[model samples]
Target: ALPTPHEIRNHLDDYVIGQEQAKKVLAVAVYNHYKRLRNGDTSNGVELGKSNILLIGPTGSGKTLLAETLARLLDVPFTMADATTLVGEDVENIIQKLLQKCDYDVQKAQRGIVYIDEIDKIGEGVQQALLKLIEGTDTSKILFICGGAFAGLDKVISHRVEASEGELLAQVEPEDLIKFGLIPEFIGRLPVVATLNELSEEALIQILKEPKNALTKQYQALFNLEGVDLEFRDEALDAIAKKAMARKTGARGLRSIVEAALLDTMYDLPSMEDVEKVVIDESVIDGQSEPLLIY
Candidate 1:
């Protein structure tokens, strides 16, 4: 009933810039879950349990972005909730929210997709609240996907592996997450674990121009409305990526850097007459030169 894994991955590529590995994992898991829903597997009279997903990544690594893309592909009711809000609060409202998304349809709600962000922020108590609902009850038919930065879990992984680097999160075991504050049962239920890579300067540069609503295209669209042709040179995009990397905010910070670089142009260009074109170069972004305006 849903798109194939390869089809899903291809669709995701249009929006998500990088993290290819994470995209593949999510595609397969989503595909398998839907298949499981329809097949009701097991030939030996033993029922197969659901395998929920856990996404581990640093801030600005597109954890939320990937999940949001999933919602576009999924036909079922999909609702997003934060783990921080669920701490010592009514977690049932998450399911209730899913119900509302489907217009109070119980069957649709049962087959809904629930994306819980910042899962690493909660502790054992909140995990208990989530675990109770996830492994049983109305959520039996629902797919629960959790994502978090898990800030210092790498230290735990490094200590266990006795190695400093090289794809630590890929080797993460359930025991490691348990050591990082997640309960054994909570980790148990989420059988599929995937990790998103940190956005590199190159990836950030691609993010600026590659996505469907890319930052460069966004600015160009804005300028087009006023009959001005806005353009960014390859060197300018490199400079933007470098500035964003220095800020340590990954792709999320690229927009701010670009805006700062274009602020003067965005302010003064419209008022000036015969500004047929505006080009951004490395000098313009570095504040060494104003944007080149064509008469």
Candidate 2:
């Protein structure tokens, strides 16, 4: 049985740090998708069609991460295909890869999810080709989740904002997407459109302290394995988040900064005797100051 939208969103919340609305959007879309499959409600001779989703956001805004998290919750076979690698024929090949995932079980594969990432990079020909792939043949049950950075689309929306009022990316309508170069029919096919917010400083801080696999917890676990306790002060977390924003890498850069800051500490901690605990502070991360070690 498929999880309820709330359940799905709750599950995502445990893994994803922020993007509150983005999580809700994907959770609902995914929930309804499986429910429709199970219901198969043609009782009144009314067919309920699947709704493909389009996720537009900046790089490292958790677009792929969100999709991947949902996939983990579903039993259905899910495949991620990079649109850049998709040539004219690669669309069919993607379907081929889906069948492969289900061990050639067409029945199961048809109900699976296929995520085509970096879709903004595709040309008109590829977009047209995708239209057929999305609609025709045994692919009807296969849920398509397309994601893209759509780098300049914001300027398009901002310019429109000058006419009206500035709203969040959630303010984006199909018309805006049309101006962003997505084919109208293609956009129409993906009825559910959601926008992911760029990670803010606070959101980045949450990324470090929260999430089941957060970077800070990961480091703590590593130290725990070595028989030492690892702790991070509030300022240390904030400092890391600020650095990530300065680098403009969103949540992706958090790990690199933490790893760099902790590398020497990690190496030295294991060799040093009588080390009971290690605390990371803002100075440790910002000024490359050594961590405070407790013996």
Candidate 3:
């Protein structure tokens, strides 16, 4: 049975944040694609092809996250690797061998999802092979979700759009990807391309507090297991977001910054039997303040 678009999207929301466009576009295509596959039927002018999806955005903007989550939610064999894996060799034999592990059922081959990350780094040679891979008989069977930070692609967008550098990537034609070092022929095989928004301070802050496995919640859980309570001031979360933003690493930097700030506390807290609460405020994020251990 195929999951509805709503179910797919709700599943994604549990693990991913923002990028409303990415969510909607990706959700619908995957649903429709699988629906077509399961039905095993198509009519004139109503047929569908392999729905290859491409996601472009800054590092840590949830492109890989979306694919990972979607793969989990879908009843399919899912595998992930970087563009380097897809490059530098004959991919035809590779696909045949890889798809066999997908239950070795011939039909399941069509249902498997391949998440190819960092595709922007693929060499010119692979592009030639890639175009053929998607355009050949396997085209209707295998689905690919390719992603890359493609950091600073806004300039590529601006150049083609005839304006200044900006992140207007929903309109990316497969051809546009060539500007970012992707081969034009390879891009042609990918029919859908969407961009993830770089995390904003508000969004990044929400990620810390929201989401089922938020960084803040993970940390809090660790403290609770240690028999201590953890609390954070709203300002402290804001400061964390700001710190992550300052490094331009997007959400990827949040955990490192928070962990670095608390390494001393984590190391010493269990040694102190009297400390029952850890109070975190924005000051702790800055050199001006430190985490307070309450007994």
Instruction: For each candidate, give its TM-score against the true structure.
Output: 0.93, 0.93, 0.87
Q: State which candidate has the highest lDDT.
A: 1
Model 1, C-alpha of 228: deviation from truth (Å): 1.4
Global lDDT of each candidate: 0.83, 0.82, 0.75
Off by over 4 Å in 3: 44-46, 85-105, 136-139, 163-167, 287-289
lDDT of 1 by residue, 1-295 (tens): 5799999999999989788899999999988887787777463587876878899987888888888788777777888988887643478888778888899998778778888999999867889888987886567878889999988788898888873322888778889898999888889999988898888878888898898899989999988888888888888888888887777888888778888888888797779765455555655455878887787
Q: 1-295, model 2: which lDDT tens digit per residue?
A: 6688899999989878777888889988888887887778353589876788999888899988888888888877889988887566667888888888899998899888888899888778888888897886688888899999988777778767653222447578888888888899899899888788888888898888878899878988988888888888888888888888878998888888888888777777768865455555655455656778787
Error of 1 at 223 (Å): 0.8
Q: Per model, how many backbone clashes are there?
A: 0, 0, 0
lDDT of 3 at 180: 75
lDDT of model 2, residue 106: 85
Ranking by TM-score: 2, 1, 3
lDDT of 2: 0.82
Question: How do the residues 1-295 of candidate 3 rate in per-residue lDDT, one tens digit apiece?
Answer: 6778888888888999888888988998888777777776474657666567888878899988898788779867776766676543556655766576676776777677777788877767777766666765554566788898775566667677773122467556655677678776677677777678878899998898889999878988988888887787788888888888878888988888888777877898788765355545644566455677677
Given candidate 3, what's the lDDT at residue 40? 62
| Deviation (Å) of 232 in candidate 3 | 1.4
Which residue window of length 10 is worst by lDDT in model 1? 275-284
